[PDB]
Structure formats: C-alpha cells, structure tokens
Design a protein around this ligand. Sequence first.
Ligand SMILES: CCCCCCCCCCCCCCCCCC(=O)OC[C@H](COP(=O)([O-])OCC(O)COP(=O)([O-])OC[C@@H](COC(=O)CCCCCCCCCCCCCCCCC)OC(=O)CCCCCCCCCCCCCCCCC)OC(=O)CCCCCCCCCCCCCCCCC
Ligand SMILES: CCCCCCCCCCCCCCCCCC(=O)OC[C@H](COP(=O)([O-])OCC(O)COP(=O)([O-])OC[C@@H](COC(=O)CCCCCCCCCCCCCCCCC)OC(=O)CCCCCCCCCCCCCCCCC)OC(=O)CCCCCCCCCCCCCCCCC
Ligand code: VO4
Ligand SMILES: [K+]
Ligand SMILES: [K+]
Ligand SMILES: [K+]
Ligand SMILES: [K+]
Ligand SMILES: [K+]
Ligand SMILES: [K+]
Ligand SMILES: [K+]
Ligand SMILES: [K+]
Ligand SMILES: [K+]
Lengths: 29, 676, 557, 190
Amino acid sequence: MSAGVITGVLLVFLLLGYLVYALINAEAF
Amino acid sequence: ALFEPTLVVQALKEAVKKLNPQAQWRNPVMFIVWIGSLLTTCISIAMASGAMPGNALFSAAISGWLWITVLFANFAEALAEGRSKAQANSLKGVKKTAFARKLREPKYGAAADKVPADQLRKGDIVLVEAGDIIPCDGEVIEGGASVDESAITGESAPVIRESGGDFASVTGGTRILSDWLVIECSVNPGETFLDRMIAMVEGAQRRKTPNEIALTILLIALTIVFLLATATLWPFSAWGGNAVSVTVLVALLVCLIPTTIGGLLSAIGVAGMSRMLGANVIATSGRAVEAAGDVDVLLLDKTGTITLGNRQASEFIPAQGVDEKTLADAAQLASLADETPEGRSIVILAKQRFNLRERDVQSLHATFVPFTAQSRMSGINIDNRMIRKGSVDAIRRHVEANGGHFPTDVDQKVDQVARQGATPLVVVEGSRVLGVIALKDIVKGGIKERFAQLRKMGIKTVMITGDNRLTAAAIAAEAGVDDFLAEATPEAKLALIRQYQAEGRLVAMTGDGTNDAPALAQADVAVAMNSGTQAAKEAGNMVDLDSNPTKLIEVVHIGKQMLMTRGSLTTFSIANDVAKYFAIIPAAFAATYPQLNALNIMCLHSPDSAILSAVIFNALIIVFLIPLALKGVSYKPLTASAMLRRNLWIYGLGGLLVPFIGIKVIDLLLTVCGLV
Amino acid sequence: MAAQGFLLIATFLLVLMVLARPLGSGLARLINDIPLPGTTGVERVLFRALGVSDREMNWKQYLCAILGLNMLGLAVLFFMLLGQHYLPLNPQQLPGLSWDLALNTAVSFVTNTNWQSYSGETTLSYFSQMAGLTVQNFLSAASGIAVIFALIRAFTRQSMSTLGNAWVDLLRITLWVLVPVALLIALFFIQQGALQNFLPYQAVNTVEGAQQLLPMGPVASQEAIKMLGTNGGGFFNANSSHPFENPTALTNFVQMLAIFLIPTALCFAFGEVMGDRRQGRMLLWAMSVIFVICVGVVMWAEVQGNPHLLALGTDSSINMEGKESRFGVLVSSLFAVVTTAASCGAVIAMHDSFTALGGMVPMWLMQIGEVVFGGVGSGLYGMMLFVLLAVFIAGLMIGRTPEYLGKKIDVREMKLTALAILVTPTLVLMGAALAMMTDAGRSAMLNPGPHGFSEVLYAVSSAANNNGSAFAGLSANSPFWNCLLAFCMFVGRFGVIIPVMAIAGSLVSKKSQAASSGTLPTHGPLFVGLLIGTVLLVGALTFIPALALGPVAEYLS
Amino acid sequence: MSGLRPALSTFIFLLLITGGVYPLLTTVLGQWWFPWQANGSLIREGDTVRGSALIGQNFTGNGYFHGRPSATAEMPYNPQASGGSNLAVSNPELDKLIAARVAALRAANPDASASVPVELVTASASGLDNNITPQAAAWQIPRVAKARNLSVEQLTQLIAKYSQQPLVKYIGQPVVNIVELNLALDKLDE
Ligand SMILES: CCCCCCCCCCCCCCCCCC(=O)OC[C@H](COP(=O)([O-])OCC(O)COP(=O)([O-])OC[C@@H](COC(=O)CCCCCCCCCCCCCCCCC)OC(=O)CCCCCCCCCCCCCCCCC)OC(=O)CCCCCCCCCCCCCCCCC
Ligand SMILES: CCCCCCCCCCCCCCCCCC(=O)OC[C@H](COP(=O)([O-])OCC(O)COP(=O)([O-])OC[C@@H](COC(=O)CCCCCCCCCCCCCCCCC)OC(=O)CCCCCCCCCCCCCCCCC)OC(=O)CCCCCCCCCCCCCCCCC
Ligand code: VO4
Ligand SMILES: [K+]
Ligand SMILES: [K+]
Ligand SMILES: [K+]
Ligand SMILES: [K+]
Ligand SMILES: [K+]
Ligand SMILES: [K+]
Ligand SMILES: [K+]
Ligand SMILES: [K+]
Ligand SMILES: [K+]
C-alpha cells in the first residue's frame, strides 16, 4: 500500500521470525 | 559485599554498555526492546529533521526512556555479575603480583629462586615463609605450619598442613601465617582451584538451566502475542480515520512485554549462584542447584563427625583452678587436627575469645592424630602429654584404659550442659581434665524447627550415622530428623537410595565423595565433604568447603528461593499489563475513538503524560526490583498450597494493584513538574 | 427476569451433569481400551473385515492417521462439492459449487468449523448435504475425540512408547457414541417439527395469494450430529433460528445439552481414567464458573438491550432484533454463550444484531482459545495446554519443577505448549489485519463504525478458533475471504492438533511420581481460581486492544 | 502404501455408514413414526397446501394478525432466503426501519395502545417467524375485531386456544401460531 507500511510489515515479519527461531532454539538463547 | 556500594556500582555502570546487538540478541525480549528503542530514536531524529510531521519531543522522551529501560536491565545483570566476581577479584587481589619462591632441591636449605613464575609444571618444588602466599595447589613434601584458609573459606581460621596423612593438601590463594613448608606441585595452572573458581564466576549463563530455558520460552511467547497485537493495532486503528502513531505503538509494546523478569532473569541466576558460592558450596552449573529444589528426601551423613554439624562451640568452662586461657589454648591445639565443623568451631571460639591465631609446629615437635569415626577423638602429642579431645563416654573409656581416674568435679557441669541440651565434649591431657565444653545450636529457630519446616514443605529427612542404635536414637531425637539409619554399609546405602528413588521421590545426599562415591553418583543431588578439590570437582558431587552435613538444607533453600523468585517476578510482570492497558489504551485511542476516555479509571492528565508515565514506570520497576532479585524472595516455609496462596497474595495482587498507584504518582510528578 | 435466568442456568447445568456422568463413564471405558458391553465380537469381526487388526502405534503414526483421514475427507468433499450437479438427489437442479466456495466449505467441514458463507437451501443438493457434510460432521468430531483420547492415554500410561490404535479409536467413537446418541436426538427432533424427508421443494399457496417454496430435505439427521459433534453447520442460511431446525424450546434445550454433552463427558472420562475424580471436577468447576459469569453478563447486556427503542415508541427496551420469538432473550443469550464458548457455529439469534457488550463476551470466549466447554475435545486439549501453563506458573511460584498428574514437564513439552497457545491468536490477528488492509476485506462490511471491525474480528476468530459462528452481516462469499478463512481454519486445526500429539508423544515416555505433601494439589478452589485467572488473563492481555477498538468503542459511542 | 489399506477401508466404511445408513434409518423411522412432522407440517385441505405450521407467511390484510418483520431477500417472507436483518444497535438504518415500523403500526392500530410491542417492530433472527407473544397478539385485538365484526372475548379465547407454552416458563416463551390462527379466522367467517 505504501513504502512505510511495507517496511513496517517486513520489520514485523523479521521480528516474529527471530522470536519464533528463538523459541525453537531456546537452549542457545 | 553489602548492597549497592559505590566502590563497585560505578565500576559496573562502566560495564552496563553492552548495548551492541552482538551481546543483546541472546536475550530475545530485550533485543525486541533494543530494536524498538533504535526504531523510536531513528524516527525521532527524522521527526526533528523534518521527514514527517509530529511532536519530535514526546517521541524523543519515549526513545530516551526506552534506552534508560535497556540500561537498567543491563545494570541489574551488571550488579549481579559484579557481586559474583567481587570475591574472586579479592582472591586475585593478593594472587596478582605476589612473591613466589621456588627451590632447586626438594630438601630444606637449598638455593631458592626469587622469580614469581606462574608456569610451574608437575613436580615443581616451591617453599614459602611466614606471612607469604602459596603459589598454587600442591602437596606438602615435609614441614609443619599454621595456614589461614580465609581466602577460600571466607572466614579466618588456622589449619595445620604437614607431611603424612590427609593433611598434606594445601591450596594456592590462601596465605601461610607461621612457619615454612615445602610443596610439590600437583596440578598445572589452568585446572587449579583458583582458576576453576574464576571460571565459575565468569562462566555465568554459559549452560542455561532448563527452568531458565522454559521461562525464556514463556517470555518469548508472551512477546510474540504482544508484538502481534501491537503490530496489528495499526491496521485496526487505520479504519477509524487516523492511525495510531508508531511511537505510541512501540511504547505500548515495551510496556506490555515482560521487561521486569526479562531483564532480571540473568540477575536472578547469577545472584543465586553467588548465594551458593557464598555458602561455600561449589557447583559446576545451576542445574544441580535447581534440581536440589525438586528433591523429596534428604540423606544426611555424619560418619567421621560428631552430631549433624548444627551444634558448634559457644562457651568455655574451666573445671577448677584452671585458667580459661589455658583451657582454650589446649582445646584449640587439640582441635587443630580436627577437620570436622565442630573441631573448626572450637578454633573459631578460641580466636574470637582470645585471638590465638598463629601457632608453632617445629618447636613443639607435635604429632597430630586426625579425627576418626571409630574413636570419636582428635588428639595431639606435643612432647609427652597425651592431649586428647572427644565425647564424654570416649574420655571415660580413655581414663579407664589409662591409670588416671575421671574426677567427679565435672559431673555437675556435664549434667548442666546436658540440661541446656548442648552436647558436651571433654578435653583430657594425659591424666587430668581441665574442662568440659558446650556445643550450642547455631540455628535461631532450632534444628528441630528447621526439619519440621522441611517436612511441612514435603521433603523428608534421613540421617545416616553408622553408629550404635542407642546413640542414633538420641541423635535423631535431639535433631528432629524423621527417621535414622545406623550401622551403614555402602551397599545398604545404595539400596536405600534405590528404594527411595523407586517410590516417586528424588534423593539428595551429602557424603565424603571418595568413601561414598557410588552413592553420590546414584543420587541426583550430591554434596562432597572433606574431599580433594582437584579429584572431586571434575567428577562432580558439589564441593562443600566447610564439610558441614547440614549444608544440603541451605542448598535446597537457595535453589527453591531461586525458583520462587523467578515465578514471583514472572507473575508480577504478567500482572502489570492490566494497569498498563488501563493507562495506555485511552491514551492511545484518544483521537481515533474519542469515546474511549471512559476507560481512563485513573484520572490521568493528557494522553502523552499517560504513555510517558507508563514507560517511566516500566523503566523504574526494574530498579525497584533489583534488590528483590539480588536477595531473593523472603519466603516462609509452609505447605505447597499455603506457599502458593501467600505468594499469590504478595505478588499477583501486588502486580495487579501497585502499577496503578505507580502510574498515578508518576503522572502527578509530571503535572507538578510541568513537563507535560 | 433474573430469577428466570438463574433457574434456566441451574436446570441446564443440573441436567447436563446428570446426563454426562454415564456418558463420561462410557467414554472412560472407551479410553481405557475395554470394549463396551454387548459390542465385542461384532467389533472384532468388523475390525478383521476392515483390516485394521491390532496396530498399537506411537504418536507419529497416530498423527499421520488423523491427518491422512482428514485429507482424504477433504479431497472427497471438495470433489463432491465441485461435482454436485453430476450426482443424484438434486431436485432443484442446483449447479456445482465454485472453486473458492467448495474449498472453503470443505475446509470448514473437515476442520470442524462449519462456516456457512453461502445459503445451503439454495446452494447444496440432498446428496451433497447428506453424504459429504454429514459424513464430515461425524468424521471431524471423531477425529477431535480421538486426539483427546490420545492425550488422556498419554497422561495415563507409564513409560510406554505407543498411544493406541487411531483407527480403532475412530471406529469405536463413531459407532458407539456419535451414531446412536444422534439417532435418538434426531428421532426426538422428528417427533418435534424438524424435517427428515427427501421430497422436492413444496410450492405453497399463501392465504393472500403469494407463493412460497419451502426447502424440505434431510434436516434432522444433519442437525443431530451438528449439535452432538459441536459442528454448527446448518441446513439453511439460518443456522438454528429456522423453524425446520429448532421448532420447540424442548428441541433447543436438547440441542444445548447435546452441545455440552461431549465436553462434560470427556472431562468426567478424564477424571475417571486418571483415578482422581477431583482432577476432572477441577476442569468442570473452572469451565462452569467462567460459563456462568459469561451467561449472566450476556443476559444482563441483552435484557438492557437497545436504548433507542424506548425513545422510538416501544413499551420494552429488550434487544429482540435478530432474535426468534419462540425463545426468550434470556434463552437466546444462553444459546449464544453455549455455542460460542463450545466451538459450535449454531445460532438461534443473529449475533450481529446483539448489543455491543452482549457481543463482546461471545467473541472474547472465542478468542481465549475456545476452552470453556469448547469442542469435542478440541477445546479440552486447549484447556489442557492452559493447565500445563498454570502448573508451570504455580510450580515456579512454590519452588518446584512443574508436574501435572505426577508427570514432569520439560523444555520440549513447554515449547510445544507455547506453540499450540501461539497458533490461534496469531491467525486471528494477522487474518484480521489482512482483512482490514484490503478493499476486498473491507467491502464485505455491512455495519458502519466499530461494529464492522467487530464483524471482521468475529469472522476471523470463527475461522481460526474453529467455531464458525458468524456476524452474518459480513459478505464472506468473496474468493479472498474464502481463501483467507480456509487458510485460517486449516492452520487453526492442524497446527494445534500436531503439537498436542507431540506433547502426547513426549509424555508417554515418563514415569508418574506418587503425590507427596510437597506435591502441588491440582484440584480445589485455589487451583480452580488459578486456572480461571490464567485463562482470563492470557485472553485479556492478548485481546484487550481489539475489543477496545471494536465492541468497547461501539458500547461507549 | 503401508497403512493405506486400513485408512481407505475405515474411511469408506464410515462414509457409507454415516451417509447411507444413519440418514436412511433416520428417514425410515421418521416416515414410519411421525408423518405430518417429517414432511413439513403442511396444512392441507382439498389436496392443496396453504402453508407449513411452523414457517409463517407475510400477512398484510386488515383482518389478520400481523407477525414480526422479516427483512429477507427478494420477498418479505421468503423461505428460499432465511436469516434476518443483521443490523446492529449503532446502525442508523435499524433506527430508521424501527421508526417506520412504529409509524406504520400506529397508523394501522389507531384504537390500540401507543406503545407498540418490541416483537412487532424488531425483525427476528430468521425471517420465517410464525410466532408472537400473547401480549403482542392481544395488542392488536381491536383492529382485527373491527375488521372481522367479532368480539374481544371471542378473539381472546381463540388466541388462548391457539397459544402453546413450554414445559417450564424459563426455557422459552408462550407463543401464538399466526398461520393457523389466521386460517381459523377465515373459517370463522362462515
Ligand atoms: C446455586 C449455587 C451455585 C454453585 C453450585 C454448586 C454446585 C455443587 C456444589 C458442591 C460444592 C461444595 C461441596 C464440597 C465438597 C468437596 C468435594 C468436591 O469438590 O466435590 C464437589 C461436589 C461433590 O462431589 P462428590 O460427591 O464429592 O463426588 C464424589 C463422587 O463419588 C464422584 O462423582 P461425581 O463428582 O461425578 O458426582 C457427584 C454426585 C454423585 O453422582 C450422582 O449422584 C449423580 C448426580 C450428578 C451430580 C450432581 C449435579 C450437579 C449439578 C451442579 C450444577 C447445578 C446448579 C448450578 C447453578 C448455576 C447457577 C449459578 O454427588 C452429588 O450429587 C453431588 C452433590 C453436590 C451437588 C449438588 C446438586 C446441585 C445443587 C446446587 C446447589 C448446591 C450448593 C451447595 C454449596 C455451593 C458451593 C459453591 O461435586 C460437584 O460439584 C457435583 C459433581 C458433578 C459436577 C461437577 C462439577 C461442576 C461444577 C458445578 C457447577 C458450578 C456452577 C458455577 C458456579 C457459579 C459461580 C460463578
Ligand atoms: C491475584 C492473587 C491474589 C489472591 C490469590 C490467593 C487467594 C486465596 C484466598 C485465601 C483466603 C483464605 C485462606 C484460607 C484457606 C482455607 C480454605 C481451604 O480449606 O482451602 C481452600 C483453598 C485451598 O485450595 P487447595 O488447598 O488447592 O485445595 C485442595 C484440596 O485438597 C481439595 O479441595 P476440595 O476440592 O475438596 O474443596 C473443598 C472446599 C475447600 O474449602 C473449604 O474448606 C471451605 C471453607 C473455606 C472457603 C474457602 C474456599 C471455598 C470456595 C472459594 C470461593 C471463591 C471466592 C473468592 C473468595 C476468596 C477467598 C476464599 O471447597 C469447597 O467447599 C468447594 C468445593 C469445590 C471445589 C472447587 C470450587 C471452586 C471455587 C470457585 C471458583 C474459585 C475462584 C474463582 C475466581 C477466579 C479468580 C480470578 O484456599 C482458598 O481459600 C482458595 C480460594 C480461591 C479463590 C481465589 C483464587 C485465585 C487464585 C489466583 C488467580 C489469579 C491467577 C494468577 C495468574 C497469573 C500468571 C499467569
Ligand atoms: O554418614 V554415611 O552416609 O558415610 O554411613
Ligand atoms: K503464553
Ligand atoms: K511488564
Ligand atoms: K465448529
Ligand atoms: K455457521
Ligand atoms: K490465547
Ligand atoms: K488456546
Ligand atoms: K483452539
Ligand atoms: K482447534
Ligand atoms: K498467549
């Protein structure tokens, strides 16, 4: 829809992916 | 080292600056807070430059308070690590730049090297003098001296190290007070006791405990649902006509996620390990400390010791015509060979009453008799006097063996000491008795009250004594233990461990470590007493420096206190978000849905003031809960349901209530300061 | 009014308990692998004929069995809906369904969601409605009860590696629970005014001279398993407001009892199999307290209904808009809470015409995870996940490593519990966000203001939480809406079933220690209140902003 | 291909059972036991249906008892399109519709009370609503009495004849079957 909106959407996607990866690999975090 | 002293608080505020992402992404919650802080700072810089319209001052204050929150979270961990490493730095304060002397021949009178070389390999021969520092761990080849073990025990007390027996074992960091010894090097630098304790205090959270892993899993899941709600709040509020500002979104996200437990988890772990090491119990990691809180039965160990170690010396009683200084000197000299905690406490009482401290070994020409279980005696032959120390019936058998008779003057004294209930010990010097000493209890509530509290908490107590059933019943009745085992073999000990482990219980056992090695290997939690550190810590079975059989009580209490601190701060962090919602939601939707001001139960001034007050409270609650994380929770030993009720009343209702009061008083401060 | 509502709640709970105790004993017998009396022998020769035999298999093969049966049913139903005009029992000559509608209906009926975006009476033929939809109503219910059977068996068994035969579980459940109880319920409904015919649509000469075409078909057979399996897939566009489905208050009471019959009997069976009935009574007390509070709140909010009715010239202010006149406003509120908390899509009142406060609590009971008497086991394992979270919190709060029923809980089980908790609010929030950033999702709206966002949130919660109750003002027949909702139901069923079975496979291999004085009592008022508090608090901290932007904003206005 | 045979076998068995035995047995038992209830509750005389006993029709005459509003598709009382008007409280269209219905009811009933019942101005959950409360049916007695030249006591006892009640007063409401009441009103004209 917009540049700021799509950068926010991808930033939220990377944050959720990082947190999901941290939940799967929780011994190393 | 007190609580928050300025000699180390500033030195660790220099070390708070772990703000780089390479040291922050290991913690997911505060990496989320760091990313949000960087985002808010960047968009505040853009707002001040003129990229997008906005306040550019409220956003800057929000970003600054988020950075302050990250700094406080790192400050809690910095204080925990500094308090952990302070005692090791104090041990290394005298170890670094020390005078180390190395001989050329193993015998005395040889040429000595005045080079403080720390590359001493196996078989290296060193010698030390009066008022010196041992280079490293090793075995004494010959000689005799008074060694103060204060550097590793934490309290000043003279021991005797000499050739022969088990007394030829001296460590590095402790100083030598009185005479000269020659020491053969036994370990390489890198596996010594001081380096292992240094690696203990710097190897914090290298191997994360499963409780911390599962709590981190909960915090990650809570961060995920809060991030999802906060991120999807922008398209939800875009339908109302105007969107919620992203600074408000990042502030609400930081206020929602559990930053309290998320910043204090490492502080809890490191402070619990510091409380373990301050009790002179050394474990490789916190896994065994946490597993000590899961045990259902405690197996004690008092072979080779008198009583359970809860009774220690408090008073000296002359018999008749005997100087108290002479009696204390004789008792201290007899208790030099006693490595048991009662025998150490005689030396503590002697030094706290008269300050004997240093002794002399070569001029005395004294032979030391170590404490044994079968004799219950600890004596010393200086020139010809048969100085001995032990229980009253043991001294009665000793004077029945020799020609001197037991005098009848001390019967009233031993009956009086038994009347206050302290166990009596009698010192004999050849053929005469100079006094009877009393061993008062150290626990203020009483050891029976402590064992009753542990029985209420669901942990059984089993006392193994290896003695006669007449003595074992009296010891169990005086101690308050639920059941006792006597005339014990290692096979029967292993059978007892297996039959307690079969019926749905976890067994924690203290022991010798060498004489009780299969039992300690079978037990889930194992504590070694009077064991060699180099040959013990590699195998496991956590080293007890005082060799006190009641140290398992403190280990269980510290592990349970760690677990309850983690659970209580998790409950507080989850419960704070209700008042966070009540403070932020009418502030966040003040323009999109102006009818939502009715949810403002707290009469907050402005939406900016409400959001700023929520962020300020989120920053300040971490500092307000640093002392609770460092000192643990003041938990009362009760049943499981009563403990859950009391902890819920203290912490869940507290985290429900006091964020309302905190946000209200912070907004009151903002209004009377005129910042908003 | 308040006394009548309290009497209604009390008699509903009383009849529910006295009906679900013997079904609880029978389900406990089904869990414990002892065959039902009078069924063995016939069951043995049936298993030998079907070739299932004795295959005592583990959690991976159990999960593969459940997912294989669900994909087979999905493919069969999807191709049946695409080719419904090539099949008999089609007197209206209805054409085959489109690809998006067929995919959404297949996913909603396999994933036990039962979302009717269409009108069934003018969309589906009798053969489709009888052989795909009723069969999937049986099969999804049997799959959910089989999954909760596996979870209960995992909690019960000691140091094993297997979990029972999934095909034997499905066959036993469908043959001896789902078929005869729904047969009795259907014959009671045919004794009342419901339909069990196969005639073409009847042309009616109205008294004024108009024309009516009554949709007459096999209604009661689908209705009975819709109510028993907590499906919610109505024959007509009205789910249970239509008089050929719910003609009588007795029919509605039997419908509500059938909706809560399987969850209450499953809790009783859990308490019977583990040998401590207080463990099942804990779950029953928690669900009953939350259910009674929600019914009272919705009942009050619906009695104090539309405030503009008094100003517009009406003697009463009760919200009778979108409510059947055969049932009271109290009965409509009770049915709303019963099906909305029980993961059932059936409605006797239009939830879009409800009050804002009286519609907030339904979608909140949806969004908490559908655990308050939810599903045919599908909300029972969600409540079990919340119990695992609660025993983790309470074990840390007392200072012990957590354990439920003597079995310790570790890193892997907490990972899977956290993932199963995470799956459905993630689907709700990103599905609603994708719906409200698109004109294809915001063009289905009917009510202006925050009630439209309430409609979007209710629809995405229905898809993700496998409820299927609809704020029916939304026009969810778009291809985008059908694909989004189908994705939400597929993930919300099979991304919660998979980690629950993984917890089951991680819990079969653990010894259960005997309870001691320091062992946490997982029953009693303290743990009931703790479980209620953690469910309510997790739901609140997840969904306060959405409810604030929707129903709270509509309430305040 | 390992467990494919038992999976297909149990799926085929459950499909044929739950789609051609349970509905078949339910249909056979229903048609054996309850005709006129399994077949639509149709009202037949002269071999011509005039409506189901449960569905309800759009009555606009002066001599008939008016039911609840419906707001269905393409027709007011359309059985091919069920589901009522999903208009929320905050929707102004619902307020406009209710105001129009109140004005129409006050124009149609001049000698009745000025406060109309809520059921006669608010649309039902499904538009096929055959039931109204006895209070809402007794509110419109004078208009039907003036149109049919009958008496208030006769209409009251006819309503009480055609009023059914649940077993207990709290699981439902007393209701009046509108359709058979209006056919009774037609039969009373002879
Ligand atoms: C209006 C009041 C509001 C609250 C209602 C409270 C209802 C029950 C009260 C009992 C609690 C106090 C008793 C203390 C004893 C401690 C032991 C214990 O835990 O057992 C409890 C109690 C006694 O069980 P037990 O005899 O120890 O079990 C041993 C059996 O061997 C194992 O078999 P079993 O457990 O499967 O079945 C036991 C059954 C043996 O089986 C039978 O003989 C078959 C009968 C079926 C079960 C009985 C029907 C239960 C219906 C409950 C709901 C009806 C009204 C609800 C009102 C809703 C509106 C607010 O024996 C009985 O007959 C049960 C006796 C007690 C039930 C009384 C009957 C209903 C009257 C309601 C008013 C009573 C007020 C008392 C004080 C209130 C305290 C808050 O268990 C029950 O609660 C009933 C069992 C079945 C239901 C499961 C639980 C569901 C939750 C209940 C509904 C709650 C409503 C929501 C609350 C509202 C707040 C927002
Ligand atoms: C926010 C935190 C702040 C507060 C937290 C702490 C609150 C505790 C209150 C303490 C005050 C009294 C202290 C003295 C206790 C003596 C009473 C006694 O015998 O023990 C009963 C009980 C201990 O239970 P237990 O030892 O586990 O029971 C095991 C028994 O062996 C087996 O027991 P049983 O099954 O045989 O039961 C026999 C009997 C035992 O009791 C008696 O002996 C009767 C005489 C004493 C009455 C006390 C309990 C009776 C019923 C409780 C009424 C609840 C109203 C609330 C009022 C609070 C004060 C009682 O109970 C009955 O007569 C009823 C039988 C049916 C069983 C289940 C009934 C469910 C109760 C209704 C729902 C619970 C609250 C819902 C609200 C949710 C809150 C959000 O102690 C209580 O008084 C607890 C009451 C619970 C109410 C509030 C619970 C809130 C928990 C936190 C929620 C937030 C979650 C945080 C999550 C955050 C992280 C995610
Ligand atoms: O005190 V012992 O457990 O070595 O018999
Ligand atoms: K969670
Ligand atoms: K917090
Ligand atoms: K459903
Ligand atoms: K539906
Ligand atoms: K949730
Ligand atoms: K859930
Ligand atoms: K769910
Ligand atoms: K589900
Ligand atoms: K959650």
